[PDB]
Design a protein around this ligand. Structure first.
Ligand SMILES: CSC[C@H]1O[C@@H](n2cnc3c2N=CNC[C@H]3O)[C@H](O)[C@@H]1O
Ligand SMILES: CSC[C@H]1O[C@@H](n2cnc3c2N=CNC[C@H]3O)[C@H](O)[C@@H]1O
Ligand SMILES: [Fe+3]
Ligand SMILES: [Fe+3]
Lengths: 409, 411
């Protein structure tokens, strides 16, 4: 049933990024009504109402791309190059995935305490699914396929794994699918995964042009990936699995597909993604990009292509923190756009845009959306024009978290 | 106990200019570093000295934070960010209110330094309100008494000379008195010359903020931009032209001095080369988070290299930062520059140790015989590879496990 919450500052997280003072929200499981808090308490004098002075009320965050299974990692993988990182992940041989549950639960709570209400979890083995189901998080689990050599047996085992994930779906868990990358998934295997997504009305995700090594491989079949398949996979393949970026992009034509990273995608490739996929969603991971390729996503190019970004943490396999607030501050440091303008992009990248990417009914304070709401408390009240930036700079731990109208924190 | 002891760790960062990394090495030290070598061989050579080895840990010099403003430690959201003019205007409009009831935040700021591995601080001070707490802290302190004043006044000079004498009388083995000229837009030329002369007469170090914003650059070079109305609007002073005709006019005042130049992101290559050739002993200080919050432009490290200079990394104050942990500042530094990460990690580490020690004329910042025994130990859950050790340390180091200052255990 219904209650009223208000704060000195409310971030609607519409595309305008509206900031409202002394506003309130009536909600049960959904957002019922928005308005001035005092007027709301007069209009509904019999409801529970709480006001949080010197606080910010905003939608719970959406973290559209993380790898919970790698939550054990601290220094198991090399940083400073993508090729060095990928080689270290493969040479690790999955050892970091063992004894996983403690780090995954710690990872889940880092999300919730950071204000994250919804997660796009990339999963290769569904080892994190149980803990996610037991958490209050909204979860879209992308079962991610790996395989550079076609095998009908591996397809059937993968479709059997996806059926197990589908049978766990409920109001908090949506099953989805992922193609790992252009260098790691053979074309006909990827086409099969994409077809299964269409047959099951599932979302799609993929890592795209994350490194110069991948760009030189995809475009000219040269560079570091020349020996990658023999050295690491014991596969006799010495040419790219896809002749050019367009060959890969076109597989996702007329789909709802998340494209992650993308820093080495030219303006031609980004425009192709928009025009071919129709419902594409660019995901940016600032800290992961700095640790691996070392190149940040060119946001001006993204704007020139007519696209927008959601900001995600990635996994601890390529990050030091799963707090989305930490990622948003790294995002502010990773781009030289005017900070006040960049703060709005960061906030929308953590709310409305991620919700649209995951096809969730949240990420914005608007009637009929889910009552996924965060309250962050501070020692002062920010000015209207500084509110968003100061929030991103100082927000560390959530003071109140409501998910589906129920108090979680 | 002024006796000697041995400490070793799986990884030791010497922080020489080579940035040497050594495995299973140890250090013998009393108040100074006495001997360096393989830890096991050190325990055989000195079997009666007290000896500890820290597995899966990093031993390195205590950090030097060459530029901070402790007096502004109360600040969280009192000042505007997103532009330098917006920030400076908000600081002035604050009217010093954030400076009142200061001691609680200053003690918290001090302790944030120590737990971050910082052993030495370059503290910029306008009123010496933080000096007392600094003195009874174990930190090595170089307090730069900073002069502000855009209109010449002999009375203001004499009161400033008198405040510096008050600071000089507090000097000891842990406190060095120094002087600072705030900025080209805030200090009248003959007032700055007087401060610089006082530093020479007292053999004091100097520090200054230089070309931190586009607004300052347009003012200094062409007497145009936001600073046109700054003196009437904020200071009630009838001044409409720059206090210095060009950057070289300001730089040349510090000719043949030991002067720290802070920020500098809007200094051209010629200006940086002028600083190097004229000052002779200049030290560039970079504050990545403050630069992002104010002007929004990062220091061009390639330009700094082209000018033949190097940088030390500092936190600035909470007036223009969210954390005074130098480790947080170093991670922000890694995010603020697109240089190859392994190469940038070496610059960051040396920027927090040896370079800052040289800037403050301190006998530390490096694990070398006869240097001060200012040593940090950071513990981890794994042993880093030799080539990843410095970067992984910067990424994962949060709180120090052991801090020794002058050979005495502090943490
Ligand atoms: C062992 S092949 C690559 C594996 O690394 C995993 N991964 C973890 N974090 C990331 C991963 N993949 C690509 N780029 C970095 C980041 O997205 C990915 O799921 C895949 O299982
Ligand atoms: C014209 S008043 C400026 C005052 O702000 C203080 N300040 C605090 N942090 C910084 C300050 N000065 C210049 N740029 C930003 C940073 O260095 C400075 O010491 C001075 O007292
Ligand atoms: Fe990923
Ligand atoms: Fe400063």
């Amino acid at each position: 049933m219904q209650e009223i919450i208000g704060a000195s500052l409310v971030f609607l997280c519409n595309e305008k990024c509206e900031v409202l003072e002394d506003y309130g929200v009536v909600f049960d499981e959904k957002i019922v009504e928005i308005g001035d808090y005092h007027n709301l308490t007069l209009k509904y004098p019999h409801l529970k109402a709480q006001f949080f002075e010197n606080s910010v009320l905003l939608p719970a965050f959406i973290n559209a791309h993380t790898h919970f299974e790698f939550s054990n990692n601290k220094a198991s993988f090399d940083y400073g190059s993508f090729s060095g990182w990928l080689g270290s992940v493969l040479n690790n041989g999955g050892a970091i995935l063992e004894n996983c549950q403690g780090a995954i639960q710690n990872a889940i709570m880092a999300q919730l305490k950071s204000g994250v209400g919804s997660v796009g979890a990339i999963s290769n083995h569904l080892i994190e699914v149980n803990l996610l189901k037991e958490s209050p998080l909204n979860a879209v689990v992308f079962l991610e396929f790996l395989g550079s050599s076609y095998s009908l047996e591996k397809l059937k085992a993968f479709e059997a794994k996806f059926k197990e994930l589908k049978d766990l779906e409920d109001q908090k868990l949506k099953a989805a699918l992922a193609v790992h990358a252009p260098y790691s998934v053979q074309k006909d295997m990827a086409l099969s995964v994409i077809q299964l997504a269409k047959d099951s009305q599932s979302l799609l995700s993929t890592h795209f042009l994350e490194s110069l090594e991948e760009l030189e491989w995809v475009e000219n079949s040269k560079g570091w990936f020349e020996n990658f398949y023999q050295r690491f996979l014991k596969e006799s393949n010495f040419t790219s699995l896809y002749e050019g970026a367009n060959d890969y992009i076109d597989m996702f034509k007329d789909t709802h597909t998340l494209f992650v990273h993308n820093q080495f995608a030219s303006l031609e490739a980004l425009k192709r993604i928009k025009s071919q996929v129709k419902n594409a969603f660019l995901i940016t991971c600032p800290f992961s990009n700095r640790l691996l390729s070392g190149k940040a996503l060119d946001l001006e190019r993204v704007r020139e292509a007519g696209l927008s970004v959601s900001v995600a943490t990635d996994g601890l396999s390529s990050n030091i923190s799963l707090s989305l607030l930490d990622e948003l501050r790294a995002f502010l440091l990773s781009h030289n756009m005017p900070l006040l303008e960049l703060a709005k992009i960061a906030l929308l990248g953590a709310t409305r845009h991620g919700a649209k990417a995951l096809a969730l009914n949240n990420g914005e304070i608007e009637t009929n959306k889910r009552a996924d709401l965060s309250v962050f408390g501070f020692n002062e009240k920010f000015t209207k024009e500084q509110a968003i930036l100061q929030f991103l700079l100082h927000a560390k731990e959530v003071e109140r978290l409501f998910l589906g109208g129920k108090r979680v924190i």
